[PDB]
Amino acid sequence: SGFRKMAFPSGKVEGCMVQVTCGTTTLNGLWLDDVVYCPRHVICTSEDMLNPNYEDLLIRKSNHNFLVQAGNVQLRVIGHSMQNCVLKLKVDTANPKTPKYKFVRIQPGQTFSVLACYNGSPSGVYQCAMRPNFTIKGSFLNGSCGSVGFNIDYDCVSFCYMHHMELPTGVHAGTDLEGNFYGPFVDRQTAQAAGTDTTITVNVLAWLYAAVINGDRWFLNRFTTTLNDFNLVAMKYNYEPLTQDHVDILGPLSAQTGIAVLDMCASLKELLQNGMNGRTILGSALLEDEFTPFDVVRQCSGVTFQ
Amino acid sequence: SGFRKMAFPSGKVEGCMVQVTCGTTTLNGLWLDDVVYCPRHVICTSEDMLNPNYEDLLIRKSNHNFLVQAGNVQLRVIGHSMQNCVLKLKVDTANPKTPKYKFVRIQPGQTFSVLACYNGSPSGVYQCAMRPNFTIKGSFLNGSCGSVGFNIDYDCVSFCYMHHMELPTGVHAGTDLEGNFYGPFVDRQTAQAAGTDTTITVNVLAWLYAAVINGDRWFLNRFTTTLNDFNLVAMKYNYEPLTQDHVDILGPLSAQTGIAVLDMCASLKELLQNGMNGRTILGSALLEDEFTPFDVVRQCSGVTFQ
Numbered sequence: 001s002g003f004r005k006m007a008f009p010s011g012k013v014e015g016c017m018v019q020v021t022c023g024t025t026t027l028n029g030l031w032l033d034d035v036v037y038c039p040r041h042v043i044c045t046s047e048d049m050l051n052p053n054y055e056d057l058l059i060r061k062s063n064h065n066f067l068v069q070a071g072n073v074q075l076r077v078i079g080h081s082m083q084n085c086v087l088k089l090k091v092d093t094a095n096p097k098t099p100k101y102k103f104v105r106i107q108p109g110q111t112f113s114v115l116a117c118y119n120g121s122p123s124g125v126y127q128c129a130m131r132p133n134f135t136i137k138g139s140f141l142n143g144s145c146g147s148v149g150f151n152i153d154y155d156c157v158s159f160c161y162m163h164h165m166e167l168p169t170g171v172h173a174g175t176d177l178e179g180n181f182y183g184p185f186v187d188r189q190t191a192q193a194a195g196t197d198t199t200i201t202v203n204v205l206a207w208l209y210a211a212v213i214n215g216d217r218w219f220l221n222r223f224t225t226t227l228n229d230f231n232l233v234a235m236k237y238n239y240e241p242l243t244q245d246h247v248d249i250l251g252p253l254s255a256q257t258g259i260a261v262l263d264m265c266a267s268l269k270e271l272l273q274n275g276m277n278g279r280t281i282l283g284s285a286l287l288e289d290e291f292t293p294f295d296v297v298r299q300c301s302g303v304t305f306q
Numbered sequence: 307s308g309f310r311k312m313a314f315p316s317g318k319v320e321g322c323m324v325q326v327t328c329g330t331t332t333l334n335g336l337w338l339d340d341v342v343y344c345p346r347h348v349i350c351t352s353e354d355m356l357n358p359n360y361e362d363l364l365i366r367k368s369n370h371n372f373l374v375q376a377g378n379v380q381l382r383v384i385g386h387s388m389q390n391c392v393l394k395l396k397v398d399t400a401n402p403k404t405p406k407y408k409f410v411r412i413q414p415g416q417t418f419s420v421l422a423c424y425n426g427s428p429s430g431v432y433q434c435a436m437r438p439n440f441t442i443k444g445s446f447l448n449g450s451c452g453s454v455g456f457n458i459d460y461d462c463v464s465f466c467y468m469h470h471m472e473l474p475t476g477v478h479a480g481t482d483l484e485g486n487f488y489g490p491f492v493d494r495q496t497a498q499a500a501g502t503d504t505t506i507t508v509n510v511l512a513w514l515y516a517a518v519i520n521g522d523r524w525f526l527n528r529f530t531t532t533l534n535d536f537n538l539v540a541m542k543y544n545y546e547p548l549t550q551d552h553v554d555i556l557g558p559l560s561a562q563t564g565i566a567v568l569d570m571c572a573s574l575k576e577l578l579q580n581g582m583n584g585r586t587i588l589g590s591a592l593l594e595d596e597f598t599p600f601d602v603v604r605q606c607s608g609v610t611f612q
């Protein structure tokens with residue numbers, strides 16, 4: 001029993017984290033095989049905020065202008081190239097700790113673990129979600145860029161996020177590991193702001209199923225809803241539309257608990273319309289939307305506490 | 307910016323996790339140097355619930371009745387002893403991945419990371435606190451006992467918790483790494499229940515300071531309180547008494563924000579008496595008490611967003 005915001009064990013990623021320095025700029029990089037991946041921001045100077053031209057900035061650099069430090073070992077850079085908003089530094093040594101890995105570009109509503117790092121040293125691990133507006137609500141201080149986000153599946157690390165920047169609302173923006181930003185953001189000092197965000201409906205429903213699996217049914221009711229009428233309510237509360245595909249995805253949790261998906265939708269509609277009246281669910285007084293259906297199945301028992 | 311329930315990076319502990327089997331009972335163990343630590347429950351049989359006599363159960367075992375599996379390598383047990391509610395199995399191989407480590411018995415209100423494991427394989431990492439009633443609100447399924455809790459400080463892992471059992475309210479009980487339970491619990495199938503719990507006042511205050519550091523002052527007021535009058539309110543709301551030592555401990559956060567501790571106490575008193583009125587703090591609609599003052603200082607910037 002119990003339900004926590006749980007991250008993947010971070011060891012396989014810890015062994016990949018390095019420090020990259022170009023001139024006076026230092027940040028984190030990810031060392032896999034003989035390549036180090038890092039934000040291309042590392043070639044920026046103190047003046048290059050407004051409109052840096054990265055191609056122009058990079059042609060002015062040589063391999064030896066890049067310093068890569070892996071623990072107490074300096075790695076020699078033997079090639080460099082830029083791919084979208086990431087730099088790839090070929091080093092003369094393959095990381096002996098490279099895990100089995102993949103690079104994945106995730107959809108909004110998907111969750112992942114973040115290993116926050118400073119100067120190539122991991123500091124903490126936490127779970128977050130790609131928001132519908134393609135920001136993440138992370139916890140990052142200066143020096144954290146190049147920290148990565150990941151999922152682990154049968155010992156294969158799927159990297160999905162590299163941290164670049166903090167927007168004015170305190171939320172975070174970054175790229176996949178091929179350097180393409182999530183969302184409309186660009187790596188330049190221009191007015192950029194998070195777009196209006198929405199609540200991830202399919203994840204709220206998954207977490208209501210987690211609450212039931214764990215033994216709690218207070219918020220359930222005798223009603224059902226059509227998918228159309230639910231989505232009318234959802235739209236009113238700034239929730240994302242629920243698709244038939246989402247309903248399909250919630251199938252296994254529905255079957256484990258015996259609660260039809262559209263019946264849980266009627267539960268959620270009542271919760272939106274009436275609030276919680278001072279009660280909690282899984283120890284929260286708000287509806288939680290940063291657990292996917294897969295996350296619930298992974299963490300919860302396969303046997304419901306009936 | 308941002309504030310998350312952050313765990314320590316778990317790699318140094320992952321490399322220590324093994325599987326221990328005695329007869330038909332299997333659970334997790336912790337391999338440090340040439341010793342494996344595990345719950346003494348591993349020598350229990352299917353019938354030994356009510357009142358097992360562990361000394362009697364153990365004298366009936368030999369070294370070879372214990373099977374220790376570390377990845378795909380079997381470790382040979384060459385000695386065994388029991389210390390309180392843990393077993394120590396001397397193996398013929400020192401763990402080459404042993405980190406610098408210590409064993410610590412923590413006070414209630416202290417936090418730590420848990421690496422949940424099954425069959426010696428880590429599954430997830432999360433943060434929790436030793437509650438005042440000496441349970442933890444973990445996330446554990448069958449097979450998780452022997453999973454450990456830990457803090458990391460300058461590459462030294464301080465182990466503080468080994469998981470044993472789940473109580474009827476779904477909260478969790480376990481030992482320090484020398485096998486002494488936290489709380490009054492015993493490892494036998496007898497009616498045992500969590501005692502009434504309280505909210506960890508000094509941690510709530512730390513988290514209010516985190517909210518201010520991150521840029522949010524809505525809940526502040528122009529009032530102060532004496533420590534005595536605050537504790538009268540605290541006692542009324544099932545909060546723990548605040549001591550002058552706690553006030554001292556909150557000194558650095560007070561100094562970083564310019565908010566005297568007793569002024570933050572007046573804030574908290576108002577929040578208890580009036581509720582939040584639909585507002586949130588650091589994205590929570592409840593007052594959070596599983597961040598220590600040390601946790602806040604570690605995660606937050608050293609510069610307040612004024």
Ligand SMILES: *CC(=O)c1cccc(NP(=O)(Oc2ccccc2)Oc2ccccc2)c1
Nearest residue numbers: 039041044048049145164165187188189190
């Ligand atoms: C650390 C890192 O990798 C990084 C990546 C992108 C952007 C930034 N900092 P920022 O202030 O923008 C730049 C400044 C100078 C040179 C290039 C980019 O990020 C930012 C934040 C909010 C709005 C606009 C830009 C660091």
Ligand SMILES: *CC(=O)c1cccc(NP(=O)(Oc2ccccc2)Oc2ccccc2)c1
Nearest residue numbers: 345347350354355451470471493494495496
């Ligand atoms: C897995 C493990 O290490 C462990 C440690 C202590 C207790 C248990 N299970 P439990 O049902 O009690 C025992 C059963 C059989 C033999 C010995 C102990 O735990 C428990 C839970 C709630 C009330 C009382 C006991 C597993």
